[PDB]
Structure 1
Amino acid sequence: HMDTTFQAAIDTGKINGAVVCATDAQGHFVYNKATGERTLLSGEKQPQQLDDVLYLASATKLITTIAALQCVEDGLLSLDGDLSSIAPELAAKYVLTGFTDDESPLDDPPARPITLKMLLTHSSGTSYHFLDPSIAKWRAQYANPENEKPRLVEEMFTYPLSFQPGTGWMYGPGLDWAGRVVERVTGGTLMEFMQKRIFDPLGITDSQFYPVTREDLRARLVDLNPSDPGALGSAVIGGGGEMNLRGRGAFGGHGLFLTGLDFVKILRSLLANDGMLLKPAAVDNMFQQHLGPEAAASHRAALASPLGPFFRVGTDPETKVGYGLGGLLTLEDVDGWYGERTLTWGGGLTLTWFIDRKNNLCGVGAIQAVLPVDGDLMADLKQTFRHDIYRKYSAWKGQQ
């Protein structure tokens, strides 16, 4: 269970603490717990607190997903519309299909336009070079000889597509592109849009994209410490290969900092479907399979690949899953755990979240790890959270 499992990891020195926040739609069952300690830049230790500012890493993707769907409500975008005009950098990408045996690249022009739905579901073709061996080999020719200049989204993610748009699945910068599209069609920064449309309606004021400049937030950053004087989020990412340090502007793929308490407000608004962020029908559409037949087969292949455990977010290999607007989507019940159409993703190696509408539960679990981060231990700690919270929910339901 969380209490003894987290304490054992603290005792071995592999984590400093954790923040866990879960709730049902109405706030009847609520579980909030901060465990352990944080270290300040001065070396002073403090108990972990529920309003400590956390690095969301790819938990950002859910929030960016919401922002893009709000633009859809506004009429500024559509899920299936052609993005070539707003994002010509995407339209100009070609599809890399393989290499000759003399290692010459083979590519083809894109067969169709890239759409917002493709960006939100990682079926556009844009792939992380560190997850896609083919794109990683292409990247190691057109080498940045480390021009160290800070780069916008469009200047960071310059690789060709990994497959014809709509026909595959690979995790990538789809939401960094979607965030840029939001900035272009609204005429403001992503932080401005999110603050007005997501944070203000929920009474959230303690959030920033990297770099965190606000003095009050920096005083509460878990990741501002002697192991991380740059507050880069190294502990969450598992090691510093920092995109954060080399970036310029907001990165909707991974950039946000937020408290656990504020993150669960976003989850619960979706779970309750209370109209604070999106109209109910728009939310319902998030919880559907949005991969086509070829993309779905590509998705299942990645889930069976050596990176599958990361892409499965703790779900069992026998459970059928798809990808919704915002994360992985389960397609069948697991009795005692996630109901069908549970949406789930995470950040780094240390953070995971879920929204289970059928069983009426949502929650985020964010381990605060010690460098160097033990990846196998993080998976176990995340699994303990994902199952222990349901055991706590059952006990509470039994006591009513």
Structure 2
Amino acid sequence: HHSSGLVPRGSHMGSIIDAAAAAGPVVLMETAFRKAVESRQIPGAVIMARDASGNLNYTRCFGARTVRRDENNQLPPLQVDTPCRLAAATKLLTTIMVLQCMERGLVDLDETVDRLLPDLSAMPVLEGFDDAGNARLRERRGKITLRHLLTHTSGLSYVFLHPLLREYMAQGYLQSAEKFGIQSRLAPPAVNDPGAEWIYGTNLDWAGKLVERATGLDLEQYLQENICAPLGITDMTFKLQQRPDMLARRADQTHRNSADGRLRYDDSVYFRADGEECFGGQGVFSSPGSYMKVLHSLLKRDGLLLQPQTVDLMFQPALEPRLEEQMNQHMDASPHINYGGPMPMVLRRSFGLGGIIALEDLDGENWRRKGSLTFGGGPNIVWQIDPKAGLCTLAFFQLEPWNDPVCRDLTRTFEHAIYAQYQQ
């Protein structure tokens, strides 16, 4: 029988295997993250999941915030409070700032942009190039509204994505615009008329300008007063170079080389120069912890950033049938871009305000539900908010390029496990 004064534990091999039950989905998933760091497939990752009740408050950090060894020859850890490059995960923040302007009566979503953005309204549409080889520009048909900007239906694209714009740069129309190695996000012409199609573009850079002009504040100040302050965030900024405490702790960017699949240090412009102006499309540096505070507040509908009914607006399908059909066609045919990250390659989607909306359950009752909102950022950052499931999640890496198979697979494994164990 048992030893006097001591707790009755397992006393031989058979009864020690029994005393602890088998490994659940979350434990197994954590092992997969640890192995991916151990085998040098990723530098590191932070994964986080929350529900509204507080019963789910899960944060795990794996690996390093860089591939460069520090002053003690160690690889410093990626932490929940490590300042990271958000890239397009900034777009959700800028969307929130716009909606706050709407709430305070500074703007109307269906108002034309001409009043606050006459510089955008004046820009032509690039229709193509004649056989002579010169640019064929024309006047826009219809007006861009704020809701066009928030839903990426304005006609704006990104130079690095659209062939017409790539040829536009090639012909030498966009050389004088850039500063400190970062491209002038505002110079290129539009490639369609507003309302014509869903096109991923510089819409939130323009929406950020609109906020600055409507409020009389620069985006950094507006961010601090209206997103950071009410959530107690002190770690979220457009102006990393002016925050020496964040600078000393920041993640380095890592890039996976096409050839040998090896990880290398990525010495890119965004970490050694702020520029002068805040870009609402891609400019924010923040910790995963601070970002989760935003997601969680939206999930809770706690009124700290926006009124519950304004938040509900973000999750409503914004596109009419023709646009919804065209967006789905484009996304299904573009797995090389993969806007939806871990989501199935073929899925019925729409766009809300702030991200892609799933119009059907991803896998019945096993994973994300209809009505869930999602987007991401370049360095394999993925966020989602799932009101019907009562969960929000984020997977933060600092690894380019976007849509890295190892990161996507780990992200899927993380979400699947959390849903399997904790979705209510």
The C-alpha deviation readout for 1:238-294, integer Å capped at 9, x for no partner, is 884769858431111111111212111111111111111111111111001112344
The C-alpha deviation readout for 1:12-47, integer Å capped at 9, x for no partner, is 323221111110012111211111233565354333
Q: Is the 8 A contact 1:238 1:372 kept in 2?
A: no
1-side partners of 2:116 and 2:177: how far apart?
A: 27
Judged with a 3 Å threshold, the aligned counterparts in structure 2 of structure 1 residues 292 and 163 are, in CA distance, closer, same or farther, namely farther
User: RMSD over aligned Cα, in angstroms?
Assistant: 2.9
State the partner residue of 1:216: 245
Q: Could you tell me which amino acid in structure 2 is paired with residue 16 of structure 1?
A: P
Matched, 1:91 2:121: yes
Q: Name the SS for the 1:312 alignment partner.
A: coil
Judged with a 3 Å threshold, the aligned counterparts in structure 2 of structure 1 residues 66 and 327 are, in CA distance, closer, same or farther, namely same
Per-residue deviation at 1:93? Answer: 1.8
Identity %: 38
Matched, 1:331 2:362: no
State the partner residue of 1:271: 299
Judged with a 3 Å threshold, the aligned counterparts in structure 2 of structure 1 residues 374 and 323 are, in CA distance, closer, same or farther, namely closer
Q: Name the SS for the 1:21 alignment partner.
A: strand
2-side partners of 1:258 and 1:209: how far apart?
A: 9
Judged with a 3 Å threshold, the aligned counterparts in structure 2 of structure 1 residues 244 and 296 are, in CA distance, closer, same or farther, namely farther
Which one is further off, 65-74 or 116-125? Answer: 116-125
Q: Name the SS for the 1:269 alignment partner.
A: helix
Number of matched residues?
Answer: 385
Q: How does 1:1-400 map to 2 (within 5 A)?
A: 1-39=28-66, 42=71, 43-145=73-175, 149-150=179-180, 155-223=184-252, 240=268, 245=273, 247-307=275-335, 309-334=337-362, 335=364, 336-369=366-399, 375-394=404-423
Judged with a 3 Å threshold, the aligned counterparts in structure 2 of structure 1 residues 104 and 241 are, in CA distance, closer, same or farther, namely farther
Per-residue deviation at 1:372? Answer: 8.1
2-side partners of 1:298 and 1:247: how far apart?
A: 36
Per-residue deviation at 1:349? Answer: 3.8
Q: Could you tell me which amino acid in structure 1 is paired with residue 332 of structure 2?
A: A
Q: Where does the alignment leave 5 or more consecutive residues of structure 1 unmatched? A: 228-234
Q: Name the SS for the 1:311 alignment partner.
A: coil
Per-residue deviation at 1:315? Answer: 2.1
2-side partners of 1:109 and 1:271: how far apart?
A: 42
Q: Name the SS for the 1:33 alignment partner.
A: strand
Which one is further off, 111-120 or 36-45? Answer: 36-45
Q: Is the 8 A contact 2:384 2:392 kept in 1?
A: yes
Which one is further off, 326-335 or 4-13? Answer: 4-13
Judged with a 3 Å threshold, the aligned counterparts in structure 2 of structure 1 residues 266 and 147 are, in CA distance, closer, same or farther, namely closer
Which one is further off, 288-297 or 337-346? Answer: 288-297
Bigger relative contact order, structure 1 or 2 (CA pairs below 8 A, ≥6 apart)? 1
2-side partners of 1:286 and 1:87: how far apart?
A: 23
The C-alpha deviation readout for 1:74-126, integer Å capped at 9, x for no partner, is 11111111111211121112222333444444443111221111111111111
Q: TM-score, normalised by structure 2?
A: 0.83
Q: TM-score, normalised by structure 1?
A: 0.87
2-side partners of 1:317 and 1:149: how far apart?
A: 37
Judged with a 3 Å threshold, the aligned counterparts in structure 2 of structure 1 residues 92 and 301 are, in CA distance, closer, same or farther, namely farther
Per-residue deviation at 1:134? Answer: 2.0
2-side partners of 1:148 and 1:13: how far apart?
A: 36
2-side partners of 1:37 and 1:152: how far apart?
A: 27
Judged with a 3 Å threshold, the aligned counterparts in structure 2 of structure 1 residues 87 and 21 are, in CA distance, closer, same or farther, namely same
2-side partners of 1:214 and 1:169: how far apart?
A: 37
Which one is further off, 53-62 or 99-108? Answer: 99-108
1-side partners of 2:170 and 2:296: how far apart?
A: 43
Which one is further off, 327-336 or 142-151? Answer: 142-151
2-side partners of 1:197 and 1:253: how far apart?
A: 18
- Higher Cα Rg: structure 1 or 2? 2
1-side partners of 2:221 and 2:282: how far apart?
A: 17
2-side partners of 1:210 and 1:254: how far apart?
A: 12
Q: Where does the alignment leave 5 or more consecutive residues of structure 2 unmatched? A: 1-27, 256-262
Q: Is the 8 A contact 1:239 1:372 kept in 2?
A: no
Q: Name the SS for the 2:48 alignment partner.
A: strand
Q: Is the 8 A contact 1:126 1:170 kept in 2?
A: yes
Q: Name the SS for the 1:364 alignment partner.
A: strand
Judged with a 3 Å threshold, the aligned counterparts in structure 2 of structure 1 residues 284 and 308 are, in CA distance, closer, same or farther, namely farther
1-side partners of 2:135 and 2:232: how far apart?
A: 51
